Amino acid sequence: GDLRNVTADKDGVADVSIEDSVISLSGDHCIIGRTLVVHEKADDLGKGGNEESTKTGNAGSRLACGVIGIAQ
Template sequence: MKSIAILSGVALAALAGCATPPTPRPMAHAQLEAKSGSAIQGRVTFAPHGEVTVVEAHIGGLTPGEHGFHVHEGGDCSAPDATSAKGHFNPAGKMHGHHHHHPMERHAGDLPNLVANAQGQAHYRAEVKGLVLKAGPEGILERSVVIHADPDDYKSQPAGNSGKRVACGVIKPI
């Protein structure tokens, strides 16, 4: 009987080691507002996880396909076209670039494109370096997250040729 209990304990420990690590608890979120005549709705969360920030989004009302997705400088989504959100968050003054580049070689707000399915829904998760969940010049709190109508090409300046801004939400601490 004792050997069965030991084997059960070993099996449980092995299974626990194979488990997917839990998603970090969100520390900030943005509730998206539809802009530029879109019907987009959803929520984006941000959570620190070691040297990265985990960005998760659940969004509906998109056109199918890829959409540029960025953290913007301004924490204001009041303009009907979200121009009040200003340009990409770029505290280091770098050129727009691919999100895989080192954070000191691109805008800190450059994120991977969102991809919406045929029903216009996107379920997104990315681990991003260079986003800091604090207020102030280096942080993203009280800034905004913006979805664009078109995909980011990761090279055109200053914003990746992503088209009009179709959703915007202010990033607030939880």
């Protein structure tokens, strides 16, 4: 036994089935301006930092110990 996830189906138009998952949606991110200024200083961002990841994801830029400055 121990099926742990089962999605049966016989007919049906445009049926949706979401079992144990993670869904994330965003929209538009407009920025209108006339002057953008960024000043930054960093000195110590990692001193033996361990990091793990298993079955992860994101809809953008991925980084560890970053000084991006201006992202998008």
